[PDB]
Amino acid sequence: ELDQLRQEAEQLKNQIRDARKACADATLSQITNNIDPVGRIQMRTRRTLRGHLAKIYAMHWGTDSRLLVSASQDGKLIIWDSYTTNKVHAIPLRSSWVMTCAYAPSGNYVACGGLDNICSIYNLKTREGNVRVSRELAGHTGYLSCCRFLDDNQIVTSSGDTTCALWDIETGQQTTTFTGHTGDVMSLSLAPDTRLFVSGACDASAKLWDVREGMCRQTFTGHESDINAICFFPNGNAFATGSDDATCRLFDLRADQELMTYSHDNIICGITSVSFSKSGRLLLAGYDDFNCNVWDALKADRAGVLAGHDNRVSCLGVTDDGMAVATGSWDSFLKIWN
Amino acid sequence: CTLSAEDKAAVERSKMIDRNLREDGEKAAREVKLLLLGAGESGKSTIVKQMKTGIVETHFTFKDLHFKMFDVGGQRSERKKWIHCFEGVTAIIFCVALSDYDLMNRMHESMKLFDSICNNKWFTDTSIILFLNKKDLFEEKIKKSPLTICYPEYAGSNTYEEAAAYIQCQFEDLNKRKDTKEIYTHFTCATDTKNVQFVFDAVTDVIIKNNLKDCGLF
């Protein structure tokens, strides 16, 4: 019966909420008392990557912490050299409408996707000199929100429909398809162990999946609007999100709760990007007020502000060594902060 | 200099990439982008068949002008998350099936989407090329089906010459910003090759206004 099934679902949801509440002794703010503050963070624009001619929608760092990839609304996808401002490649895209870009950990491939519902994967290192499309990944109905490389052979994708997918390069088919969401699924963030990954959707609910078994382990709620970005704690036992609710929240996998909320009354615009720093003490959040922010992780206090961009910050990421953070925005520039 | 040989060559290659990027941007600056929107029925495909996945593109040149048309009626997702990538489009093309009222009603859905596009915070300065197709079929079913079935406020005669003007003015009464942008209307049909010329004239007007704004004359 539909009525009986919905009543059971409601009472299991209540039971889960009760179990979560029963395992909350002291909040993160209370635990992080008598701990010294980070203080002001005076990051400076070390490099400005002024090559694009449209809105920077996505960025990703190489494992070397020196090679960048940027995707803009024009049919171009530039691969930069962070140290000396240069352009390693200018990859022409078959569809200028892009929403994501991913740099493979090995540096051999770069993936991109947008309103075409195609995760075009490119071959950076070939016997020729040009960069060519390795595979055109088809099978998503909605736009491609974000993609992340598990290795040179695998990639997960956050689509426009209520579906994520684990593709396998060398054969266009998708191995495991994750279907547990409602509404659009925005950016995802893989775990370091490459066995779980969190996903942000427009249902104000994030989910931790298991890429091997294909199921959803546990779900995280609390947000009041669509989650536009999500980043995963370096430890592997936490992650933080970002929503159009003008707030960010840090969740914990083994507690299943929200630990403490990154919301200031002075901010009304949403969050487009989120990236923990190394050791996970500073959380960078890219806001729509033509600006970024540096949010302390273990204390709600706000560190400095990265006011360098004329338009909305649509993308930002920390390097693997934590030495620099590069933030892209809807103005074609892409600054690197240190 | 204080650079090595490969460093200098890499800087030279980066400068070449800069030149190619600037050339491509100049090429794209000459291209007129036209977003395509429609009602529940896929009349955009039907009309574009006469002119001859998700987003689909239709490149064509008319009287020495490269055109871009972005039909995004197959996205089947939430329009909010991707309507913001379409600002800077020269003009937005919107089609309304004039015969699609005796079926919330479908013209009301069309008005809802028209309101959400015209009054969107991204398209304040973007003109809309409104198309009211199926004119013969509307003239055909206008007499049998009263307009009160979708226009309770309509009290005029059930004759085409006025029954189309009422719909045109009703659509024109949805843009709250009548100064930053303007709405162009054409009661098209299944047999009309002049729609390309209507779009061409509207695009010339829009680019004239954009040039005036750039040069400060407006």
């Epitope: 020196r66 540096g107 000199g129 | 040989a5 490969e6 060559a9 890499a10 070449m16």
Partner: single-chain antibody
Framework: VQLVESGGGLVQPGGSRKLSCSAS????????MHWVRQAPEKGLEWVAY????????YYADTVKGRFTISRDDPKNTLFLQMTSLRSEDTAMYYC??????????????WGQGTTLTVSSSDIVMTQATSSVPVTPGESVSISCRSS???????????LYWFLQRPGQSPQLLIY???NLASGVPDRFSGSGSGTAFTLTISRLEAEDVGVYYC?????????FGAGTKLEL
Amino acid sequence: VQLVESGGGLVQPGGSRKLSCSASGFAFSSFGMHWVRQAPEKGLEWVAYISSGSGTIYYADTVKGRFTISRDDPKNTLFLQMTSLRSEDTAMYYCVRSIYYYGSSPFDFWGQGTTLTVSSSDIVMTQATSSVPVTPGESVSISCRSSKSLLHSNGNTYLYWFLQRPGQSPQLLIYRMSNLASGVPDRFSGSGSGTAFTLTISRLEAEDVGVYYCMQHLEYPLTFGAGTKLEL
């Protein structure tokens, strides 16, 4: 990805000719091309260069003014017009493609080369003893010094390593200090310090036999070295 050289013959002293190589199978418009020449029984010697877009042309001291190099993107062919040929320009000229970006492998593919017959401030790189007796299955450490420190301020030593199998074209082996080219096995592994350089072969078979060369790319004349010939 064959890059075939056409041209050459019995040119009279004081004559002139043009050497053309036709690239077939890669982005010629993006690859920057090098010309190198090899005496009939001696080592290699850099000649000319054309960068991508033909915007940077650099010449060797011996061929400066005498030789005019040209690039033709649409036909995917690279030229070399030679004027006032002397008695020492006889060689088996080689065409070398080279792409320059971060993480690139310059001097990667080498053309088959063409023969030429003429009738009747620099970084000195040296290879020790020019000859090494080896046997299959052993390990050999080929070393070559320099005249100036190759370690630039950006941290990468600008050394290379090439292999010339008998009757073949040179390959790319180690495209910087402690690097490895594409297609070469894991056996080759060379690492040095500053001016001194070494290359080590773990277990050499009959395939990795011939004369080896190391060149500098720090100061642009790209001086090569002698050959360390390996044989039983």
